[PDB]
Amino acid sequence: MRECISIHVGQAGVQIGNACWELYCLEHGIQPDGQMPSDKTIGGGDDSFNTFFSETGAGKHVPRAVFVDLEPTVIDEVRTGTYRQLFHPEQLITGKEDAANNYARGHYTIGKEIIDLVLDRIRKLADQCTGLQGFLVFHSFGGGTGSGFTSLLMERLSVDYGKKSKLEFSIYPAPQVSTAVVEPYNSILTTHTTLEHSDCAFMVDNEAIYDICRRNLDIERPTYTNLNRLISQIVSSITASLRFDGALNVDLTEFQTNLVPYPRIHFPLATYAPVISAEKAYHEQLSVAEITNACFEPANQMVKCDPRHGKYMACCLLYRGDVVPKDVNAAIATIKTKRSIQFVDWCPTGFKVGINYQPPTVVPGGDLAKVQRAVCMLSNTTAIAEAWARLDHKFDLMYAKRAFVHWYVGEGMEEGEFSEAREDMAALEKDYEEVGVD
Amino acid sequence: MREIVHIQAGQCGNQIGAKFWEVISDEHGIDPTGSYHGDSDLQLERINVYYNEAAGNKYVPRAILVDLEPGTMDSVRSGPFGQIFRPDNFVFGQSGAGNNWAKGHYTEGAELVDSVLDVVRKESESCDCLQGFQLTHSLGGGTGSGMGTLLISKIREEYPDRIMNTFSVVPSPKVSDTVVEPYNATLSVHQLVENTDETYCIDNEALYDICFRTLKLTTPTYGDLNHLVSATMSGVTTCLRFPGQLNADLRKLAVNMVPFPRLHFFMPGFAPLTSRGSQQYRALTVPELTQQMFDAKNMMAACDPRHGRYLTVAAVFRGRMSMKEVDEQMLNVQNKNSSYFVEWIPNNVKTAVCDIPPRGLKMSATFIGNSTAIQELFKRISEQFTAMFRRKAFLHWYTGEGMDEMEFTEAESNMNDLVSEYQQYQDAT
Amino acid sequence: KNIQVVVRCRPFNLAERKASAHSIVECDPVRKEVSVRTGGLADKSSRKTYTFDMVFGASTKQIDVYRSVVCPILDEVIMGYNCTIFAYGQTGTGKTFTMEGERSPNEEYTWEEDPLAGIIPRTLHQIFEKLTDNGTEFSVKVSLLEIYNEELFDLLNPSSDVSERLQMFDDPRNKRGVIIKGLEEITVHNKDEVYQILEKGAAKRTTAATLMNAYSSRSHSVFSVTIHMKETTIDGEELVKIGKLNLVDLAGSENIGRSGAVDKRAREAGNINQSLLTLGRVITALVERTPHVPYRESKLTRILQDSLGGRTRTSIIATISPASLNLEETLSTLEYAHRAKNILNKPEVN
Ligand SMILES: Nc1nc2c(ncn2[C@@H]2O[C@H](COP(=O)(O)CP(=O)(O)OP(=O)(O)O)[C@@H](O)[C@H]2O)c(=O)[nH]1
Ligand SMILES: Nc1nc2c(ncn2[C@@H]2O[C@H](COP(=O)(O)OP(=O)(O)OP(=O)(O)O)[C@@H](O)[C@H]2O)c(=O)[nH]1
Ligand SMILES: Nc1ncnc2c1ncn2[C@@H]1O[C@H](COP(=O)(O)OP(=O)(O)NP(=O)(O)O)[C@@H](O)[C@H]1O
Ligand SMILES: [Mg+2]
Ligand SMILES: [Mg+2]
Numbered sequence A: 001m002r003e004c005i006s007i008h009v010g011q012a013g014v015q016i017g018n019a020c021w022e023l024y025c026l027e028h029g030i031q032p033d034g035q036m037p038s039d040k041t042i043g044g045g046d047d048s049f050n051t052f053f054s055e056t057g058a059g060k061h062v063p064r065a066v067f068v069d070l071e072p073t074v075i076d077e078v079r080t081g082t083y084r085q086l087f088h089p090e091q092l093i094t095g096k097e098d099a100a101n102n103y104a105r106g107h108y109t110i111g112k113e114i115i116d117l118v119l120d121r122i123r124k125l126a127d128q129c130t131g132l133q134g135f136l137v138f139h140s141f142g143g144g145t146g147s148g149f150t151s152l153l154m155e156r157l158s159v160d161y162g163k164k165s166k167l168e169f170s171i172y173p174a175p176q177v178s179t180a181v182v183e184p185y186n187s188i189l190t191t192h193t194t195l196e197h198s199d200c201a202f203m204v205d206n207e208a209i210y211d212i213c214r215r216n217l218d219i220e221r222p223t224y225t226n227l228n229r230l231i232s233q234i235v236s237s238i239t240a241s242l243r244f245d246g247a248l249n250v251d252l253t254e255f256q257t258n259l260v261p262y263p264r265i266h267f268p269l270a271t272y273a274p275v276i277s278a279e280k281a282y283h284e285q286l287s288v289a290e291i292t293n294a295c296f297e298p299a300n301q302m303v304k305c306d307p308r309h310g311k312y313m314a315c316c317l318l319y320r321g322d323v324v325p326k327d328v329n330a331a332i333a334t335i336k337t338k339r340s341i342q343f344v345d346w347c348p349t350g351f352k353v354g355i356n357y358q359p360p361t362v363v364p365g366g367d368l369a370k371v372q373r374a375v376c377m378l379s380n381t382t383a384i385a386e387a388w389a390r391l392d393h394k395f396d397l398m399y400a401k402r403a404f405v406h407w408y409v410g411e412g413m414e415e416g417e418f419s420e421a422r423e424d425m426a427a428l429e430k431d432y433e434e435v436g437v438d
Numbered sequence B: 001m002r003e004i005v006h007i008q009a010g011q012c013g014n015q016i017g018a019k020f021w022e023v024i025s026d027e028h029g030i031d032p033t034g035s036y037h038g039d040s041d042l043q044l045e046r047i048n049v050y051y052n053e054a055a056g057n058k059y060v061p062r063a064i065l066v067d068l069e070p071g072t073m074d075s076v077r078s079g080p081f082g083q084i085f086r087p088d089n090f091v092f093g094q095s096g097a098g099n100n101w102a103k104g105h106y107t108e109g110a111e112l113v114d115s116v117l118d119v120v121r122k123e124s125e126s127c128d129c130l131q132g133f134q135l136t137h138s139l140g141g142g143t144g145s146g147m148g149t150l151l152i153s154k155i156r157e158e159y160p161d162r163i164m165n166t167f168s169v170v171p172s173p174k175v176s177d178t179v180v181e182p183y184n185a186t187l188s189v190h191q192l193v194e195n196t197d198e199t200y201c202i203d204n205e206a207l208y209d210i211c212f213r214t215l216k217l218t219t220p221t222y223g224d225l226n227h228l229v230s231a232t233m234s235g236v237t238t239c240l241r242f243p244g245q246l247n248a249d250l251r252k253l254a255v256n257m258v259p260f261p262r263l264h265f266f267m268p269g270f271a272p273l274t275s276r277g278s279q280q281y282r283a284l285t286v287p288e289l290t291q292q293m294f295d296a297k298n299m300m301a302a303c304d305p306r307h308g309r310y311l312t313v314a315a316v317f318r319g320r321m322s323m324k325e326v327d328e329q330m331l332n333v334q335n336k337n338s339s340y341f342v343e344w345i346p347n348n349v350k351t352a353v354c355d356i357p358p359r360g361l362k363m364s365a366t367f368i369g370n371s372t373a374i375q376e377l378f379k380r381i382s383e384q385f386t387a388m389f390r391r392k393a394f395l396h397w398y399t400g401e402g403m404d405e406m407e408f409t410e411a412e413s414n415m416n417d418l419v420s421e422y423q424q425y426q427d428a429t
Numbered sequence C: 001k002n003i004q005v006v007v008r009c010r011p012f013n014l015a016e017r018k019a020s021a022h023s024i025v026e027c028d029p030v031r032k033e034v035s036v037r038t039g040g041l042a043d044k045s046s047r048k049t050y051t052f053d054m055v056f057g058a059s060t061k062q063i064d065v066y067r068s069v070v071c072p073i074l075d076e077v078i079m080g081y082n083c084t085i086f087a088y089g090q091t092g093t094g095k096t097f098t099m100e101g102e103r104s105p106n107e108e109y110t111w112e113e114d115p116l117a118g119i120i121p122r123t124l125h126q127i128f129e130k131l132t133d134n135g136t137e138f139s140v141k142v143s144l145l146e147i148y149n150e151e152l153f154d155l156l157n158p159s160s161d162v163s164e165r166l167q168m169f170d171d172p173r174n175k176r177g178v179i180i181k182g183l184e185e186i187t188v189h190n191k192d193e194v195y196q197i198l199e200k201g202a203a204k205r206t207t208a209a210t211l212m213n214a215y216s217s218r219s220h221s222v223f224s225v226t227i228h229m230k231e232t233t234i235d236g237e238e239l240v241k242i243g244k245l246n247l248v249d250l251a252g253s254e255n256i257g258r259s260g261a262v263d264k265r266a267r268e269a270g271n272i273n274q275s276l277l278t279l280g281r282v283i284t285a286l287v288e289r290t291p292h293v294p295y296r297e298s299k300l301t302r303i304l305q306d307s308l309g310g311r312t313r314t315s316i317i318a319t320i321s322p323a324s325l326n327l328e329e330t331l332s333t334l335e336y337a338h339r340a341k342n343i344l345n346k347p348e349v350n
Helices: A010-028 A047-052 A072-080 A082-086 A103-128 A144-161 A182-197 A206-217 A224-243 A252-259 A278-283 A288-296 A325-337 A382-401 A405-411 A415-436 B010-028 B041-050 B070-078 B101-126 B142-158 B180-195 B204-215 B222-241 B250-257 B276-281 B286-294 B323-336 B372-391 B395-401 B405-427 C014-019 C062-079 C095-100 C119-134 C191-204 C263-286 C299-307 C327-342
Strands: A066-069 A092-094 A136-138 A167-169 A315-319 A375-379 B007-009 B052-054 B058-060 B134-137 B165-170 B199-203 B313-317 B365-369 C007-009 C033-036 C048-051 C083-088 C137-147 C167-169 C179-181 C186-188 C221-232 C238-249 C315-320
Touching: A010 A047, A010 A066, A010 A072, A010 A082, A010 A136, A010 A144, A010 A224, A047 A224, A066 A072, A066 A103, A072 A082, A072 A092, A092 A103, A103 A144, A103 A182, A103 A405, A144 A182, A167 A252, A182 A382, A182 A405, A182 A415, A206 A224, A206 B323, A224 A252, A224 A315, A224 A375, A252 A315, A252 A375, A288 A325, A288 A375, A382 A415, A405 A415, A405 C263, A415 C263, A415 C327, B007 B010, B007 B142, B010 B041, B010 B070, B010 B134, B010 B142, B010 B165, B010 B222, B041 B058, B101 B142, B101 B180, B101 B395, B134 B142, B142 B165, B142 B180, B165 B180, B165 B204, B165 B372, B180 B199, B180 B372, B180 B405, B199 B204, B204 B222, B222 B250, B222 B365, B250 B313, B250 B365, B286 B323, B286 B365, B313 B323, B372 B405, B395 B405, B405 C167, C007 C033, C007 C062, C033 C327, C048 C327, C062 C083, C062 C095, C062 C119, C062 C238, C062 C315, C083 C095, C083 C327, C095 C119, C095 C238, C095 C315, C119 C137, C119 C191, C119 C221, C137 C191, C186 C191, C263 C299, C263 C327, C315 C327
Parallel strands: A066 A092, A136 A167, B007 B134, B134 B165, B165 B199, C007 C315, C083 C238, C083 C315
Antiparallel strands: A315 A375, B052 B058, B313 B365, C033 C048, C137 C186, C137 C221, C167 C179, C221 C238
């Protein structure tokens, strides 16, 4: 079957990959040995299993994932992780090149080295798969490299893939604060190029997720990683649901395609709900209704937003497991009340709502108490736009500053191209806003 | 790998460098045995990258010592891990600078170069590319700087990959016995600024204040002062060397900190800094350290941090970092000064955290970004120079050096231009 | 003072032809403006338009501008008013091409002779006659600036070696700005001598090779002609003036793949972009003016300060390559030209 192995760029991206992979690993229940303490999965590795990782050493479930370590540090991370142990060293690839990176510089220089290696790996995997619609990969915006990889990588892969698009994951700084100036530098250039290539984009609010975890855990820190775990969990959940058999299973791409009537919003927003504190679970089990309320409430949604403030051209929430009747019943009413939701002009139809046959699953080792339902929602969010505006504001300021010309110059990347990217981003955002308004 | 050998120039460079080596070696924690104190293999690996292995997995330093006089070399060798360091790396020059910028520069450079190539090769062996070399010298010593400058210029030229960063103590403008001493400084300053895109200096005053309070010694202990100073420097390198949950490129950061290559100046920050008793008795809270870095007293350099603003702000984190702390940091920066953050770019400060908190106190911080005061400090320094010009001191030396008197003027002009621009920008939003 | 670029449009690029894309701008000398479609595909009709004192179509040639420019050229030089020319355009613009102008093939005409050659060559020739007419002592001390890693090489200078760096100091002769002196040049007796010498100089001079254009200098090229003039007036007062002309062929924005340039060339390119950007920076920086005096710091900027808003006087003519492709860069160019517009320079005798 089709198998997607994520490619994670940047320390964060890799870290995410580690978490996500590990989370998968936990789900697999297969030891780092690669032989699962569990019995062989049904159908050997499941289609999902194969999809995430091609199965080799059959009778043993050994995940295969491609990681690039621009920094040797990543390699250490990879090696440190159990997954690497399962992974044949072939699977792991480390760039000789340093990250280094200047954001502009890194992607071009690094990408070339990676691409050849990755492509081979990809092709083999593709060969392994009956066919690969596309790859879902995680990249870090903040790192120059991470952002850089996506742009360069995406195009090539897109070409190879042809019509079938790839799903892209990105790291989106919360508009509130940016990790570094550099990231927003990456953002516009990466985003504009990437967006066209990518069918969709995944947006995460680094701060927001941290905040969300922060509230429930009621520990802001430590740990960041814990926050990461949730992020891994949420991402894992959505994929997991698709992976899991469903009475109705929709491919994510199809769903996202459904989500946006227009390519204009390539990237659905990602949300997780309900968020549940462990303690809350202790107090009581979450009700379906509570789930419903939680999902809607902006705190739950990964990005903090005012639902009025944001507009949802379309909002859908994929649910893991089985959607309860309740959940479903409750939903229409919610949608109904919610002014905030926007409309498409044309037709009211074209959506799908969708349930997975498999019962709700909880990711093992979940820091938080398990939630009966973990859900994601794809929608258009103001926050991304606002973040865009915020980035734009900074960017324009940067433009006025003409600061960090040198970094780009070192890349040899055009300032004009950069400005163009900014313009394009503005165009995209403006167009997106324009389309967003009915 | 990409280990960078540190080269010291000038009398100060030599003296500091020895401490630097000691600090670094201490950081390595590699005994003369060559066993690795650090449990982590990787940490050992980094050290291993840093220093070639003597048998017993000893690590031998890669660096060149500047020999103002051969005694200094003797000193280091005499000093601990004399065995650890191997004299082959050592370069010798009895003459030393000769306290002639030109003379020392010219004479030393030839000697240095050969060692330089050899040492460079070793590093190249270690890692194909190195980010760049950081050399410590005394800016104030004209000769010390001058000797250093040549290597730095050449090296950077040799490898664009490497970025030249220098540490030199600035004579504090606060006191000058005579104009002439700063005269050396001005020459060094002019050369240095051109030489390195980014340069780092510590004010003498900063040393004086820090040393004086801490030591309470009438006169600063060179070793003691060097120890503290080295430690802070060690922290930055250590942080970069050591893995972090998020790691930031030192170079990338360096590029980041200055909006442009133009601003050589960087403002170091070390922490925790407290009185000896204070530190021992109590441990700072994480946010406390952050605040501490803000405070002038904590920062090695002396300034009125409130008065000064940061064109760019950055923070480095060690130990576990709170997400909240980050927010606190962001908030605090805004709180303390609007000027603190650049108007141009919001939330300039970005921090990277080491995975493992530094040896000693888990929490460590460095100060990033530059302050108005330092920039003023430069301006102040030039002030001495002008007086020096009025003196036309070192007229004889200048003649002997063959260095242009006009060159001095040029240095003043150039420094003036840069300082003016810097100050103007710094003043400017 | 400073002049906004007169546009000479490069004929529709063969490479552009390879694209077979229409130029976003339609090169219409008639317009004396060019616009790229802002609408673009979305709106071919809609276009952002840029206007210059003149804009020229592909049909327009460097010569066409060149003759016009050519006359005024002498005046600046004769005075000793420093003249500089910069051409603004994308790489492969013919920024260099126009700037050089074309020598008639097989050097049927020398550079100066060729109307084909750009303004400079004719003006140089004219200067030859002019000097003759003046009867003043004219000598041209030549220095070559080929900039690699901000290193200047005097291939042009008759010495094999590159001329030494001129000292960066306000030349006391020059009222304002920073002046470079101590330059070692070998003067040539005559402009005709210049013609022959230049031929020699050209051989000496090299540009970083560019795949995109062998013609294009990968590095920013800086050709400087210094003219020492001494005459005795009707009054009989003996007056000594020095004129200087900087003809600069900056590299356009390049991407390595497009360039096909060597990595080192790319390194040059990074400088290349940096320089222009820095220069871009100057107008935006320009405004504060006090004190942290924002000017001198870069070498290029340093020359620049003299160049515009400086003792030396320069004028700007831009030639563009029809390719839309460097839209951002071209836009940057166009905007930059406007940027230049903000600050004008006052001509001065060297
Ligand atoms: N912060 C420090 N400043 C120092 C130290 N040693 C000297 N200095 C200062 O540096 C200046 C003297 O320069 P050097 O130590 O480099 C003497 P150098 O070898 O460069 O030349 P000579 O005069 O020919 O010996 C002067 O301003 C001193 O106050 C030190 O260990 N730390
Ligand atoms: N999703 C996610 N993002 C993270 C995490 N930790 C840090 N980030 C973000 O990732 C960005 C930094 O990118 P990195 O991937 O670490 O860096 P890089 O791409 O390897 O590049 P350099 O480190 O600069 O060489 C910042 O915006 C951080 O906020 C994490 O656990 N998860
Ligand atoms: N007016 C023109 N007629 C015919 N060919 C032209 C003309 N202008 C430019 N070219 C050609 O385009 C290629 C030149 O690019 P030029 O060499 O014109 O680029 P450039 O401006 O010097 N690029 P760059 O050095 O990167 O700033 C040359 O080989 C020329 O023959
Ligand atoms: Mg990284
Ligand atoms: Mg050219």
